[PDB]
């Protein structure tokens, strides 16, 4: 279930965060313009960047931490609005986030392996429903 | 304390990993005997190989998630019995994770950052008295 799910992507935390996040950009290719020095750059060489590996498992760890101090996928206010005061994330909707949710729930569903695909689609229904609720337009 | 500490390393996990690593590397060099083509190599060679970041980074990930599954610094019998089981760890024994905590341990101490030391030194008392109720040697 769920909380097996952060098990196994904590497991291989990196990996699993440039998949996924490569996934995102590759299905919303129109992303890539909020990630300045990721444009024009084959996935081998994002690999190479010290800033690709660690901005993605950083993202992915504080995923990892929203989803499990959430109840049944439902995440803390708190934490959504951590996700809205980052001055990183000032200029984002809660559009962008849900392509980002609709990208992973696809690459868990396209994996060789028994995700709770549907668990991640209502966590990141429930969490853009706190992101808006917090401020983000 | 120690469920903190558990966020601050995750929060900055390959950094950590790999000083904490270069630290039981250092101060245990025979230790090297157990892995591929670390003798010869400095620290930041080491950070400079293919696979060493990636490794340091894999036994953290598993690290973390058995201090965040432990109560009160218990560790859960399946996660001992998983460590023991691992055919990377064959031939290991107790011994060679006491080294790998105290080496830990003497870095947090060390830090600047405030970390419950005393509580990865009982954490890892506890995991090896765990790991030889599990049967390793
Ligand atoms: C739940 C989803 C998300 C989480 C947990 C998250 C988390 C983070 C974290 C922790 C950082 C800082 C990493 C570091 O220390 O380097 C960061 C930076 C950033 N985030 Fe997010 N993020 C999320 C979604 C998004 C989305 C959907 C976008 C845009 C489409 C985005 C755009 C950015 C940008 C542009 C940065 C700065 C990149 C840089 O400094 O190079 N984030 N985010
Ligand atoms: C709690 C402490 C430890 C944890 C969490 C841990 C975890 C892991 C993990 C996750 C792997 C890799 C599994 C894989 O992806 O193939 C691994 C491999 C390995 N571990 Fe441990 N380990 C620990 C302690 C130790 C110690 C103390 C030693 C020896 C001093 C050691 C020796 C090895 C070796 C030799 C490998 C195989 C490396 C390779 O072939 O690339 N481990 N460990």
Redesign the interface.
Known sequence: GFKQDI?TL?????TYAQDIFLAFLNKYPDERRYFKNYVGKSDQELKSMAKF??HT??VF?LMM?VADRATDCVPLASDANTLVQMKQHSSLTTGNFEKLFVALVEYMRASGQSFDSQSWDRFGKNLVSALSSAGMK
């Open positions: 098990a904590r497991g291989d935390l990196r590996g660690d498992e950083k760890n931490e």
